[PDB]
C-alpha cells in the first residue's frame, strides 16, 4: 500500500526526532558535571 510505506517512514522520522532530543539532554547533564 503506498500510504501504509508512508506511515512507516513517518514513524521512523518521529523516533529519530525523539532520539536526538535524548542525546541533547544527555549532553547537557554532562555539562552540569
Amino acid at each position: 500500500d503506498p500510504i501504509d510505506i508512508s506511515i512507516v517512514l513517518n514513524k521512523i522520522k518521529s523516533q529519530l526526532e525523539e532520539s536526538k532530543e535524548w542525546i541533547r539532554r544527555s549532553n547537557k547533564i554532562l555539562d552540569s558535571i
Binding site: 501504509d4 510505506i5 512507516v8 517512514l9 514513524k11 521512523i12 523516533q15 529519530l16 525523539e18 532520539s19 536526538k20 535524548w22 542525546i23 539532554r25 544527555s26 549532553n27 547533564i29 554532562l30 552540569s32 558535571i33
Partner: protein
C-alpha cells in the same frame, strides 16, 4: 559533589540509553519499509509485467 556527579553520570547514561532505544525502534521500522518495497516488487511489479 562526588555523589552528585555519580548521580549525574547515571542520568546521562539513562538518557543515552533512551536515545539508543529510539534508534532501535527506527531500525525495526526500516526493516519493515525495505521488506515492503521488496514484497511490492514480488507481488505487483513482476505479475504486472507478465500481464
Amino acid at each position: 559533589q562526588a555523589r552528585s556527579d555519580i548521580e549525574k553520570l547515571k542520568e546521562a547514561i539513562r538518557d543515552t540509553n533512551k536515545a539508543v532505544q529510539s534508534v532501535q525502534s527506527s531500525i525495526g521500522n526500516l526493516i519493515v519499509a525495505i521488506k515492503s518495497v521488496q514484497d511490492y516488487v514480488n507481488k505487483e511489479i513482476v505479475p504486472s509485467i507478465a500481464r
